[PDB]
Amino acid sequence: FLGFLGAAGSTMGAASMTLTVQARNLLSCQQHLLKLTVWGIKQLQARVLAVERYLRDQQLLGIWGCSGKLICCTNVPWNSSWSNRNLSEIWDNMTWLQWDKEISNYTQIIYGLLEESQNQQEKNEQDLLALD
Amino acid sequence: FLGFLGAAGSTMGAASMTLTVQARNLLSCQQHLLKLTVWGIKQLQARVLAVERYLRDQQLLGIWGCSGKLICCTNVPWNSSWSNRNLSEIWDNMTWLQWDKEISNYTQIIYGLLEESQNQQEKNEQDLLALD
Amino acid sequence: FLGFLGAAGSTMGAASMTLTVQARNLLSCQQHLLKLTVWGIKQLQARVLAVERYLRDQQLLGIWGCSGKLICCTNVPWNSSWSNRNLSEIWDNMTWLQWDKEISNYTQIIYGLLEESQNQQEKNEQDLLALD
Amino acid sequence: EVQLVESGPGLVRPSETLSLTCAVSGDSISTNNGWSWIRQTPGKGLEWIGYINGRSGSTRYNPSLQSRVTISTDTSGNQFSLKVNSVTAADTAKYYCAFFWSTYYKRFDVWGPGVRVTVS
Amino acid sequence: AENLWVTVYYGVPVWKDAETTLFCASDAKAHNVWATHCCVPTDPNPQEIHLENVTEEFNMWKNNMVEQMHTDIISLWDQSLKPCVKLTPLCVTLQCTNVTNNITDDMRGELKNCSFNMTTELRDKKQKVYSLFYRLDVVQINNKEYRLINCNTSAITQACPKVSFEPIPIHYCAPAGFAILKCKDKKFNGTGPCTNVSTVQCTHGIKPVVSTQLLLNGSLAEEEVIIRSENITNNAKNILVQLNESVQINCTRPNNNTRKSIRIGPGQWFYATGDIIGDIRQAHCNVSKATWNETLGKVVKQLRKHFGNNTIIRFANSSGGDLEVTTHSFNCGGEFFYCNTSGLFNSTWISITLPCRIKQIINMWQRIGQAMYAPPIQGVIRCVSNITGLILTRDGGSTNSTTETFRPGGGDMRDNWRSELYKYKVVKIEPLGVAPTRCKR
Ligand SMILES: *[C@@H]1O[C@H](CO)[C@@H](O[C@@H]2O[C@H](CO)[C@@H](O[C@@H]3O[C@H](CO[C@H]4O[C@H](CO)[C@@H](O)[C@H](O)[C@@H]4O)[C@@H](O)[C@H](O[C@H]4O[C@H](CO)[C@@H](O)[C@H](O)[C@@H]4O[C@H]4O[C@H](CO)[C@@H](O)[C@H](O)[C@@H]4O)[C@@H]3O)[C@H](O)[C@H]2NC(C)=O)[C@H](O)[C@H]1NC(C)=O
Ligand SMILES: *[C@@H]1O[C@H](CO[C@@H]2O[C@@H](C)[C@@H](O)[C@@H](O)[C@@H]2O)[C@@H](O[C@@H]2O[C@H](CO)[C@@H](O)[C@H](O)[C@H]2NC(C)=O)[C@H](O)[C@H]1NC(C)=O
Ligand SMILES: *[C@@H]1O[C@H](CO[C@@H]2O[C@@H](C)[C@@H](O)[C@@H](O)[C@@H]2O)[C@@H](O[C@@H]2O[C@H](CO)[C@@H](O)[C@H](O)[C@H]2NC(C)=O)[C@H](O)[C@H]1NC(C)=O
Ligand SMILES: *[C@@H]1O[C@H](CO[C@@H]2O[C@@H](C)[C@@H](O)[C@@H](O)[C@@H]2O)[C@@H](O[C@@H]2O[C@H](CO)[C@@H](O)[C@H](O)[C@H]2NC(C)=O)[C@H](O)[C@H]1NC(C)=O
Ligand SMILES: *[C@@H]1O[C@H](CO)[C@@H](O[C@@H]2O[C@H](CO)[C@@H](O)[C@H](O)[C@H]2NC(C)=O)[C@H](O)[C@H]1NC(C)=O
Ligand SMILES: *[C@@H]1O[C@H](CO)[C@@H](O[C@@H]2O[C@H](CO)[C@@H](O)[C@H](O)[C@H]2NC(C)=O)[C@H](O)[C@H]1NC(C)=O
Ligand SMILES: *[C@@H]1O[C@H](CO)[C@@H](O[C@@H]2O[C@H](CO)[C@@H](O)[C@H](O)[C@H]2NC(C)=O)[C@H](O)[C@H]1NC(C)=O
Ligand SMILES: *[C@@H]1O[C@H](CO)[C@@H](O[C@@H]2O[C@H](CO)[C@@H](O)[C@H](O)[C@H]2NC(C)=O)[C@H](O)[C@H]1NC(C)=O
Ligand SMILES: *[C@@H]1O[C@H](CO)[C@@H](O[C@@H]2O[C@H](CO)[C@@H](O)[C@H](O)[C@H]2NC(C)=O)[C@H](O)[C@H]1NC(C)=O
Ligand SMILES: *[C@@H]1O[C@H](CO)[C@@H](O[C@@H]2O[C@H](CO)[C@@H](O)[C@H](O)[C@H]2NC(C)=O)[C@H](O)[C@H]1NC(C)=O
Ligand SMILES: *[C@@H]1O[C@H](CO)[C@@H](O[C@@H]2O[C@H](CO)[C@@H](O)[C@H](O)[C@H]2NC(C)=O)[C@H](O)[C@H]1NC(C)=O
Ligand SMILES: *[C@@H]1O[C@H](CO)[C@@H](O[C@@H]2O[C@H](CO)[C@@H](O)[C@H](O)[C@H]2NC(C)=O)[C@H](O)[C@H]1NC(C)=O
Ligand SMILES: *[C@@H]1O[C@H](CO)[C@@H](O[C@@H]2O[C@H](CO)[C@@H](O)[C@H](O)[C@H]2NC(C)=O)[C@H](O)[C@H]1NC(C)=O
Ligand SMILES: *[C@@H]1O[C@H](CO)[C@@H](O[C@@H]2O[C@H](CO)[C@@H](O)[C@H](O)[C@H]2NC(C)=O)[C@H](O)[C@H]1NC(C)=O
Ligand SMILES: *[C@@H]1O[C@H](CO)[C@@H](O)[C@H](O)[C@H]1NC(C)=O
Ligand SMILES: *[C@@H]1O[C@H](CO)[C@@H](O)[C@H](O)[C@H]1NC(C)=O
Ligand SMILES: *[C@@H]1O[C@H](CO)[C@@H](O)[C@H](O)[C@H]1NC(C)=O
Ligand SMILES: *[C@@H]1O[C@H](CO)[C@@H](O)[C@H](O)[C@H]1NC(C)=O
Ligand SMILES: *[C@@H]1O[C@H](CO)[C@@H](O)[C@H](O)[C@H]1NC(C)=O
Ligand SMILES: *[C@@H]1O[C@H](CO)[C@@H](O)[C@H](O)[C@H]1NC(C)=O
Ligand SMILES: *[C@@H]1O[C@H](CO)[C@@H](O)[C@H](O)[C@H]1NC(C)=O
Ligand SMILES: *[C@@H]1O[C@H](CO)[C@@H](O)[C@H](O)[C@H]1NC(C)=O
Ligand SMILES: *[C@@H]1O[C@H](CO)[C@@H](O)[C@H](O)[C@H]1NC(C)=O
Ligand SMILES: *[C@@H]1O[C@H](CO)[C@@H](O)[C@H](O)[C@H]1NC(C)=O
Ligand SMILES: *[C@@H]1O[C@H](CO)[C@@H](O)[C@H](O)[C@H]1NC(C)=O
Ligand SMILES: *[C@@H]1O[C@H](CO)[C@@H](O)[C@H](O)[C@H]1NC(C)=O
């Protein structure tokens, strides 16, 4: 908790340097909870949900071939229709909150393409003469 | 949910192309649950179990050296006694349900060997002149 | 459960050969639990905690760049002030329990350095002429 | 079952290029990988020249021939060919068209009769 | 000499039979108990998947989905009554008369006018009140002194006059890691393999309707009358008959009632049955004769199929026992009717008015120890329902092929769910597996 959100106003490029700050903070009595068994449930539900959300994101990175990475490259080309901007307009002079608002509607298109790309890559690994 | 089980009647080879379809579907009120605290537990138990089953499979892939992969190679030889068939009898003209019935009794033998193989591989990585 | 703690009296070097024995054992009615809804909670709390502890360790290995490994190298130099001993005094003639007592106070210093090292490594991967 | 049929000049003069065409019957070049050329050099034996992926146009060549060899595919004709930049007497060999299938599940060859080419 | 190396696959389409807990889901659109315990909506367009080339074995008699409905239904009944007024103070000696004003002879002796001494909201004060009772719930002490029928056996509580128990179609859905498989094949026996199957997220909507002898408001077969049983040969087993044509049944309660509210304690009200307005008549059900005496003919041809080609089939009346066993227990409008079905099973193969009784203190089949008092309904009621199937019991098995006798049977609450959960099975998905390939690290 030394920047949980310190990069929020930074540009997209600059904010790429705090990815471990946000990730490490996303998976952070005695008798009362059992004597009054309403609160034991209220507390467990909050804990179970934090775990399920964490795992769903990890499963996607696994499927897309980005497991274990905070920054990962793929082979899906960027469609100009998703955002008609060049790199100097995206990485500089723009925040991640603004970018998310701009892309939002295309999130599922992009995710579907990332999954298709990884499956094609695996198919090419079961053919010993691949990519030649 | 576009094929949760669509490949069930396909051959083992053909079914290898839907591994992301099955994996992505294996880790998918308000007041009622706290007013009637029987159901809060019934629901949490179902959710906790889904998480524990997921994690046990991930731990095994980790131990065997197959983390992050849907298709993974190992160095354990296949024993002819486990199934005396050639590749043209296994990958074609056979389903995964049939294969599982055929192998079942040998599941633990195979898993034990996969763990031994990875440990031997690690030992060879702490000797800078390894495999020469 | 064939050595859950068999290596406890072994030297640090010898004990490095049982890492899969300890790891595989760290993430191991009917009506009673719902009829008496004190025990349903007592049991779920124990299960949720085992999962949360497992995941926190996995997240750290991820952040440090050691995901999927039982033995992992880093680029952080050892400070002689953390333990002024040579390798022949550490790997031989010393147990892991003794070593942990010796290092304890420096645990957080070391962990902080491991995170900084991985971030520097990632920065160098977004510059195509890196390390030359 | 794939059949491989080859033709081209059996005589090339020194400093002239060499050109051989392999016709493919029974399957589509554009669908499979592993279309390749191998030659049998007298006094040496069999040597790999290179291969092409009919699905992409990507190729790989034996380093000793990277400065001279071109492999390409005619997707209309369903034939592929080998071209070699200027050749010498040292290139006299029996040249062959072959198809190599090598995957996790199957291994097989289709190997045609070849063309004898003399450089002189 | 194959020289292959155990490769590992994850996400393999392999499944095994399993028992888990299913969750309920609804249409959203639906003070009804099942509108509250079935909050999660289903998808409006369920993702059903046909499985090509899959053969799977089913067994409706060993299906644990049935057992879960039994537990869920009785569990909800025992939660809905939790906050409501106990009627313990009414278990007092009653003074009763015969209610002889404006009575049809068929109702003579059916109602009693009972007065009694009960408390008011104050500890030191009493009131004299009276109400009407049905004779089924009033028992003579040692000719005017009467006791409530269950005072020497069980506690009594008042059904909450707010909560509806009208059936709502509900759907059962699998938890993550599980799937439900369905048979779409034809004329399924209820057991054995089916070769036309699909994977679903949830079951179709099932209404938790509970009745005896006749099965109401279910799925109406499809192509023909189908007769199913665990054994058929064993006369200790039931036979479930599912019809492909419904039979309409019209039930009514002709007496125009009113209600009175009696204070039973501070903040606690008791709802008593008041005077009947107009003539007193007997409750009854109407079955069209023109449909019933044909529906059975269809059943008989199919029933003969399992016993012989030239044998006589006889439909006899029910046997002895409690009203819950010997009569058609019918829950409608909020009141409990016990109807006489002898008029439907009185023939040999080779408008029908059924009288009904009404009971208010219900010792539900589910258990012994507590009973529910059902408050009366104001005005009059009418019910319209579909007979979709019958539960028959074979009362023979004797050494005489000449003829066989069938009687109305059943009575188990599960007989009303088994016929809908009939097409479904629960399986667990197991994603790891290994196989040899010609590839090593
Ligand atoms: C097999 O399937 C069939 C078909 O679904 C099913 O039959 C249906 O049963 C339900 C329940 O018994 C019937 O629904 C009732 O219908 C009456 C008819 O009223 C009509 O006329 C009034 C006049 O103003 C209209 O307003 C009304 O819309 C109708 O046109 C309704 O009156 C019932 O509603 C009352 O009772 C409900 C119980 O919870 C209350 O929630 C509701 O608010 C109403 O109560 C109010 O008025 C009362 C009047 O005295 C008052 O006392 C209450 O305090 C409150 O103010 C209800 O809608 C439905 O019509 C049946 N369908 C047919 C064709 O008959 C079978 O039962 C089923 N078989 C089974 C399960 O065995
Ligand atoms: C870039 O994407 C367009 C299609 O995007 C459209 O808008 C999206 C929000 C979503 O609604 C999509 O479904 C839309 O189609 C691609 O153009 C499509 O290409 C296919 C190819 O056959 C064609 O059938 C579609 O009609 C095209 N759509 C339109 C509107 O013409 C385009 O090719 C993509 N470019 C790249 C480089 O991927
Ligand atoms: C293939 O496996 C056999 C042993 O498998 C047997 O059957 C299994 C179901 C299980 O019961 C095993 O425990 C059985 O042993 C290997 O043969 C064994 O080799 C060891 C080597 O010393 C020998 O001591 C055993 O007696 C042998 N077993 C028998 C029955 O003779 C065989 O070597 C394995 N082959 C490969 C390539 O791994
Ligand atoms: C090894 O570590 C020392 C510092 O460790 C000290 O003791 C620890 C328990 C903890 O209290 C630390 O905060 C302490 O500082 C390093 O020496 C420091 O180097 C910085 C560099 O500018 C200097 O400002 C500090 O004053 C130094 N500390 C002292 C006590 O002089 C030393 O450089 C480290 N060596 C290596 C190789 O990393
Ligand atoms: C908030 O905005 C200001 C400017 O709008 C940012 O300041 C700039 O920081 C860059 C960093 O190198 C400097 O080169 C610019 O000259 C600064 N601008 C001005 C006007 O001084 C500031 O950094 C922003 N805050 C965050 C968190 O990004
Ligand atoms: C992303 O979705 C939003 C809505 O969720 C789109 O904004 C709407 O666009 C329609 C188009 O006729 C307008 O009528 C709405 O008023 C807009 N809503 C708002 C809040 O402005 C938005 O255009 C979509 N973006 C893209 C790129 O398709
Ligand atoms: C179900 O079985 C049939 C045959 O028993 C499969 O059909 C075969 O599909 C392959 C695919 O290339 C064809 O080459 C064969 O000629 C087909 N056979 C026939 C008789 O047409 C069908 O695909 C199977 N279904 C699944 C899901 O695998
Ligand atoms: C795998 O285990 C099954 C049992 O779980 C084995 O089948 C049994 O084998 C014994 C051997 O005498 C028979 O008596 C049983 O009747 C068999 N059971 C069934 C259901 O057929 C099966 O043979 C084992 N497979 C292997 C390869 O060992
Ligand atoms: C417990 O301590 C004894 C000695 O203190 C260990 O025995 C030694 O084991 C090494 C292994 O190669 C031998 O080379 C030594 O000669 C042994 N010493 C003696 C005196 O025999 C013993 O292994 C220790 N136990 C554990 C679990 O490490
Ligand atoms: C690690 O921490 C322990 C305490 O948690 C340190 O031991 C204490 O050191 C102080 C120093 O004045 C003594 O007064 C205490 O009595 C010591 N405690 C014990 C239990 O002995 C220990 O020295 C620290 N180690 C390092 C390397 O700093
Ligand atoms: C049930 O008994 C009560 C009396 O215990 C009857 O109520 C009385 O009816 C007469 C008729 O004129 C009235 O004058 C009295 O004032 C009524 N008494 C009370 C206390 O209301 C009641 O009518 C009887 N009900 C039936 C159906 O016979
Ligand atoms: C499995 O059963 C389904 C029944 O729902 C069959 O689907 C029908 O097939 C006929 C064929 O002409 C169509 O006309 C119907 O419209 C289909 N029904 C539906 C609901 O779409 C299906 O063909 C059967 N499959 C097998 C293998 O017999
Ligand atoms: C129905 O249940 C009866 C009773 O168990 C079965 O008939 C008996 O089967 C046993 C099997 O060993 C025989 O020994 C008995 O002699 C049989 N009884 C008679 C009267 O023959 C009967 O087979 C079952 N039928 C079905 C269709 O399940
Ligand atoms: C259902 O109704 C029938 C007739 O409507 C009742 O049958 C009568 O039972 C008595 C008992 O001995 C006989 O003496 C009568 O002759 C029977 N009538 C007929 C027409 O057979 C039957 O008891 C009623 N069932 C119940 C449960 O009340
Ligand atoms: C009272 O009810 C009983 C019920 O059997 C009946 O026999 C008796 O004749 C009734 N008394 C009067 C006055 O009708
Ligand atoms: C109420 O109590 C009085 C006390 O004497 C008794 O006479 C009267 O009959 C009781 N009333 C009833 C209906 O039992
Ligand atoms: C209650 O009394 C009635 C009177 O006939 C009797 O039949 C019944 O068995 C009794 N119940 C118990 C539990 O004793
Ligand atoms: C009774 O059967 C008819 C036949 O079509 C059907 O339309 C009606 O909805 C059914 N009623 C019930 C309650 O299912
Ligand atoms: C019901 O099944 C009988 C069986 O012969 C058939 O004749 C009749 O037409 C079927 N009814 C319907 C509605 O299909
Ligand atoms: C249907 O069930 C009966 C009762 O056990 C059985 O004898 C018969 O063989 C079954 N039919 C099929 C097709 O399984
Ligand atoms: C049953 O039919 C009789 C015939 O007269 C009729 O009077 C009665 O009202 C009908 N009952 C119902 C419930 O329709
Ligand atoms: C039930 O009532 C409806 C009301 O219109 C009537 O049409 C139908 O024929 C009645 N059914 C019977 C069995 O009398
Ligand atoms: C019984 O009658 C049916 C009518 O078609 C016939 O097909 C069947 O063979 C007959 N069975 C015997 C045993 O005669
Ligand atoms: C059975 O049918 C006969 C036919 O006349 C009739 O007399 C008898 O009363 C009927 N039985 C019942 C219980 O309705
Ligand atoms: C009425 O039932 C008898 C029973 O044997 C049957 O013979 C008669 O044909 C039935 N009536 C009609 C209209 O089918
Ligand atoms: C019961 O009788 C009252 C008397 O006026 C009438 O208003 C009411 O509508 C009747 N209720 C019925 C027949 O449901």
Residue numbers in the entry:
A (entry chain E), B (entry chain B), C (entry chain F): 519 to 546, 561 to 664
D (entry chain H): 1 to 35, 35A, 36 to 52, 52A, 53 to 82, 82A, 82B, 82C, ...
E (entry chain A): 31 to 60, 66 to 141, 150 to 185, 188 to 309, 312 to 323, 323A, 324 to 396, 413 to 503
What does the published report state?
The sole target for neutralizing antibodies on the virus surface is the envelope (Env) protein, a homotrimer consisting of three copies of gp120 and gp41 subunits that are associated by non-covalent interactions. Methods enabling the production of stable recombinant trimer immunogens based on the ectodomain of Env have catalyzed recent HIV vaccine efforts. Hence, the efficient trafficking of Env trimer immunogens to follicles following immunization is likely essential to promote optimal humoral responses to HIV. Here, we demonstrate two strategies to concentrate HIV Env immunogens in follicles, via the formation of immune complexes (ICs) or by employing self-assembling protein nanoparticles for multivalent display of Env antigens.
The mAb RM19R was isolated from a BG505 SOSIP trimer-immunized rhesus macaque and was shown to bind to the base of the trimer by single particle negative stain-electron microscopy (NS-EM). Antigen-binding fragments (FAbs) of RM19R bind to the BG505 SOSIP trimer with an affinity of 0.55 nM, as determined by biolayer interferometry (BLI). To determine the molecular details of the RM19R epitope, we solved a 3.7 Å resolution cryo-EM structure of BG505 SOSIP in complex with RM19R FAbs. RM19R recognizes a quaternary epitope spanning two gp41 protomers and a single gp120 protomer that has 1316 Å2 of buried surface area at the interface. RM19R uses two tyrosine residues at the tip of its CDR H3 to wedge between the C-terminal region of gp120 and the C terminus of gp41 in the adjacent protomer. Binding of RM19R causes the last seven residues (Q658 to D664) of the gp41 HR2 helix to unwind, but despite this conformational change, the complex is highly stable at room temperature for more than 24 h. The light chain of RM19R also makes contact with the C5 region of gp120, and an arginine residue at position 500 in gp120 inserts between the heavy and light chains of RM19R. Consistent with the observations in the cryo-EM structure, binding of RM19R is eliminated by combining the mutations R500A and Q658K. RM19R complexed with BG505 SOSIP trimer activated antibody-dependent cellular phagocytosis (ADCP) at levels comparable with human bnAbs VRC01 and PGT145. Thus, immunization with BG505 SOSIP trimer antigens in the presence of the trimer base-specific antibody RM19R greatly increased antigen accumulation in follicles.
